[PDB]
Write an enzyme that holds these catalytic residues in place. Structure first.
Site, short mmCIF file in Angstrom:
data_model
loop_
_atom_site.label_atom_id
_atom_site.label_comp_id
_atom_site.label_asym_id
_atom_site.label_seq_id
_atom_site.Cartn_x
_atom_site.Cartn_y
_atom_site.Cartn_z
N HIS A 1 13.20 40.74 10.84
CA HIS A 1 13.57 39.68 11.78
C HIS A 1 12.65 38.47 11.65
O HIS A 1 11.62 38.54 10.97
CB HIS A 1 13.54 40.21 13.23
CG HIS A 1 12.28 40.94 13.60
ND1 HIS A 1 12.05 42.25 13.25
CD2 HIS A 1 11.19 40.54 14.29
CE1 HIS A 1 10.88 42.63 13.72
NE2 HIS A 1 10.33 41.61 14.36
N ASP B 1 8.51 45.17 12.46
CA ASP B 1 7.63 45.84 13.39
C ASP B 1 7.35 47.24 12.87
O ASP B 1 8.16 47.81 12.15
CB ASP B 1 8.25 45.93 14.79
CG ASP B 1 8.63 44.57 15.37
OD1 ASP B 1 7.91 43.57 15.12
OD2 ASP B 1 9.64 44.51 16.09
N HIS C 1 3.74 43.77 15.35
CA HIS C 1 4.67 42.76 14.83
C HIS C 1 3.98 42.09 13.65
O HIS C 1 2.94 41.43 13.81
CB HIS C 1 5.06 41.76 15.93
CG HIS C 1 5.83 40.57 15.45
ND1 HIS C 1 7.21 40.56 15.35
CD2 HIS C 1 5.42 39.34 15.07
CE1 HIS C 1 7.61 39.38 14.91
NE2 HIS C 1 6.55 38.62 14.74
N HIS D 1 0.76 41.52 18.83
CA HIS D 1 0.69 42.66 19.77
C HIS D 1 -0.50 43.57 19.42
O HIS D 1 -0.43 44.80 19.57
CB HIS D 1 1.98 43.51 19.81
CG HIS D 1 3.22 42.74 20.13
ND1 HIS D 1 3.33 41.93 21.24
CD2 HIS D 1 4.42 42.70 19.51
CE1 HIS D 1 4.55 41.41 21.28
NE2 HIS D 1 5.23 41.86 20.24
N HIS E 1 3.86 48.61 19.47
CA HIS E 1 4.13 48.42 18.04
C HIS E 1 3.37 47.20 17.52
O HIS E 1 2.98 46.32 18.29
CB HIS E 1 5.63 48.23 17.78
CG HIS E 1 6.18 46.95 18.33
ND1 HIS E 1 6.62 46.84 19.63
CD2 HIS E 1 6.36 45.74 17.76
CE1 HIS E 1 7.05 45.61 19.84
NE2 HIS E 1 6.89 44.92 18.72
ZN LIG Z 1 8.66 41.89 15.62
#
Ligand SMILES: [Zn+2]
Length: 182
Positions: free
Chosen positions: A23, A36, A122, A81, A120
């Protein structure tokens, strides 16, 4: 070409995490620069694990939950993250150097504001400071193939092909990290 710019997967060599579909950095744009990863894709409050540099370069820390590593060639990777960041602005690292962990809670994972499903990493690819497509990029023996929409995880379109094994590796299944390719 530069070996130091050669990439591995952004978790410890010898370990396996589950990737989701490719993505854009925002999650609703183009190109598909990001995927991710998480060991188990658990709920908030669960144990999380070590994120490492995909390649050599200069660290910049963008917040308590975001880190960038930039290779002299201009290729770079972004890590979002994050929590427990153990590198400093301007620090030199190599592939497999620990950067921190992915965050285990809403407050720590979303330190810049925004939304997420659970713990998770990214992970994004950049060149010349701009987000670029993952299509055809290599991580160790794996060549990544990008899907046809943000987070597309249909394995007929999104997968990692292992050139060392002749095998295809799909989303939400453990992906083993053998480190850099020769
Ligand atoms: Zn992501």
């Amino acid at each position: 070409a530069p070996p130091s710019n050669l990439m591995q997967l952004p978790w410890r060599q010898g370990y396996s995490w589950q990737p989701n579909g490719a993505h854009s950095n925002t999650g609703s744009g183009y190109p598909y620069s990001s995927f991710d990863a998480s060991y188990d894709w658990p709920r908030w409050g669960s144990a999380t694990y070590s994120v490492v540099a995909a390649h050599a370069g200069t660290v910049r820390v963008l917040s308590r939950c975001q880190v960038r590593v930039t290779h002299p060639s201009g290729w770079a990777t972004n890590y979002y993250h994050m929590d427990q960041i153990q590198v400093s602005n301007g620090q030199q690292v190599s592939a497999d150097t620990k950067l921190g962990v992915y965050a285990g809670n809403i407050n720590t994972a979303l330190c810049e504001g925004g939304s997420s499903t659970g713990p998770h990493l990214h992970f994004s690819l950049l060149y010349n400071g701009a987000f670029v497509s993952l299509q055809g990029a290599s991580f160790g023996p794996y060549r990544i193939n990008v899907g046809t929409s943000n987070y597309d995880n249909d394995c007929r379109r999104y997968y990692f092909y292992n050139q060392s094994a002749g095998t295809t590796h799909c989303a939400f299944r453990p992906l083993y990290n053998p480190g850099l390719a020769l």
